[PDB]
């Protein structure tokens, strides 16, 4: 907790010169056309657009803490807009082009920002949501829950149980959650395209996952400011903001990003929106 392996903090960032980035993102599309199967992980780096501070950026906490330097919230959990990256996401599901969401993200945003929580593996836990210890049952709260460590937050069970209620906020030691890492590791091995948005791939199992891609022919796609872990087996690295990478993508898939009309929690994928007819490609 003190001692722990937080791994490269504040690396360089590389930024696509416009003419690379443009082309990048053009075959990101084609990558998301020809695949069947796609799986989006993120971190903390989409989240960094709506002033959450990420872990080993040039200012993440992580990388601060190592110069005695304090990271920088510009927003609080609850008062957290969804980014252009997290709606983009939203209508990729919508449509039919985004199969699963792996996200190490504890900042609750995906699921606030309307995303369905039964494709969506929140692999480190999420601040706004606790546990019944006895049944299981989980809430998805309007306030940040106060703890962190998988304790005790006070409340008690409603399932028509008064059961302990906890956080479900990992500490270094904790495993993850077996269903959440379950259903995570089926999405990445499946899936024929895995693309990461503003994660460094530096945690096990979490950074690893879109490796499981690569095996029986999958496609890579790394999107990050940063170097990663798994740089080097990625088809396509994308260095540039998530936000513009998305907002061009989304242009290219002739997709709009919708509106975020404050939390909303959808547990339940509905089957897929309309969406373009496809290309022609080779
Ligand atoms: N707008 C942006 N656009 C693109 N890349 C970005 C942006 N902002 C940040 N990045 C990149 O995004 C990356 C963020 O990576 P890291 O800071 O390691 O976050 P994680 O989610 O991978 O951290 C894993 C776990 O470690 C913790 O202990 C927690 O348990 C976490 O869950 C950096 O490389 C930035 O260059
Ligand atoms: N984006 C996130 O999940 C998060 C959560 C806590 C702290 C930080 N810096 C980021
Ligand atoms: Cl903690
Ligand atoms: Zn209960």
Same mark, same amino acid.
Request: charged fraction near 25%.
């Given at each position: 907790?003190?001692?722990?392996?937080?791994?490269?903090?504040?690396?360089?960032?590389?930024?696509?010169?416009?003419?690379?980035?443009?082309?990048?993102?053009?075959?990101?599309?084609?990558?998301?056309?020809?695949?069947? #199967?796609?799986?989006?992980?993120?971190? %903390?780096?989409?989240?960094? !657009? =709506?002033?959450?501070? *990420?872990?080993?950026?040039?200012? /993440?906490?992580?990388?601060?803490?190592?110069?005695?330097?304090?990271?920088?919230?510009?927003?609080?959990?609850?008062?957290?807009?969804?980014?252009?990256?997290?709606?983009?996401?939203?209508?990729?599901?919508?449509?039919?082009?985004?199969?699963?969401?792996?996200?190490?993200?504890?900042?609750?945003?995906?699921?606030?920002?309307?995303?369905?929580?039964?494709?969506?593996?929140?692999?480190?836990?999420?601040?706004?949501?606790?546990?019944?210890?006895?049944?299981?049952?989980?809430?998805?709260?309007?306030?940040?829950?106060?703890?962190?460590?998988?304790?005790?937050?006070?409340?008690?069970?409603?399932?028509?149980?008064?059961?302990?209620?906890?956080?479900?906020?990992?500490?270094?030691?904790? #495993?993850?959650?077996?269903?959440?890492? %379950?259903?995570?590791?089926? !999405? =990445?091995?499946?899936? *024929?395209?895995?693309?990461?948005? /503003?994660?460094?791939?530096?945690?096990?199992?979490?950074?690893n996952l879109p490796l499981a891609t690569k095996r029986r022919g999958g496609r890579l796609v790394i999107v990050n400011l940063q170097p990663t872990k798994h740089d080097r087996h990625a088809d396509l690295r994308?260095?540039?903001?998530?936000?513009?990478?998305?907002?061009?993508?989304?242009?290219?898939?002739?997709?709009?990003?919708?509106?975020?009309?404050?939390?909303?929690?959808?547990?339940?994928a509905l089957p897929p929106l309309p969406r373009p007819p496809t290309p022609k490609l080779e």
């Amino acid at each position: 907790p003190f001692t722990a392996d937080k791994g490269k903090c504040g690396l360089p960032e590389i930024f696509d010169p416009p003419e690379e980035l443009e082309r990048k993102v053009w075959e990101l599309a084609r990558l998301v056309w020809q695949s069947s #199967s796609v799986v989006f992980h993120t971190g %903390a780096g989409i989240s960094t !657009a =709506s002033g959450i501070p *990420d872990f080993r950026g040039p200012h /993440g906490v992580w990388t601060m803490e190592e110069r005695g330097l304090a990271p920088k919230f510009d927003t609080t959990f609850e008062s957290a807009r969804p980014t252009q990256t997290h709606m983009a996401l939203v209508q990729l599901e919508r449509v039919g082009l985004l199969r699963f969401l792996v996200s190490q993200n504890v900042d609750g945003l995906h699921v606030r920002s309307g995303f369905p929580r039964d494709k969506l593996a929140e692999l480190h836990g999420n601040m706004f949501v606790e546990e019944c210890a006895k049944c299981k049952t989980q809430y998805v709260r309007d306030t940040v829950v106060g703890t962190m460590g998988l304790k005790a937050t006070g409340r008690l069970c409603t399932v028509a149980c008064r059961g302990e209620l906890r956080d479900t906020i990992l500490d270094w030691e904790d #495993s993850l959650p077996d269903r959440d890492l %379950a259903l995570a590791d089926e !999405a =990445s091995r499946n899936a *024929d395209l895995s693309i990461t948005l /503003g994660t460094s791939l530096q945690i096990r199992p979490s950074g690893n996952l879109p490796l499981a891609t690569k095996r029986r022919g999958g496609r890579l796609v790394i999107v990050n400011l940063q170097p990663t872990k798994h740089d080097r087996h990625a088809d396509l690295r994308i260095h540039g903001y998530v936000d513009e990478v998305m907002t061009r993508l989304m242009k290219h898939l002739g997709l709009e990003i919708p509106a975020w009309d404050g939390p909303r929690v959808l547990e339940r994928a509905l089957p897929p929106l309309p969406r373009p007819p496809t290309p022609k490609l080779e």
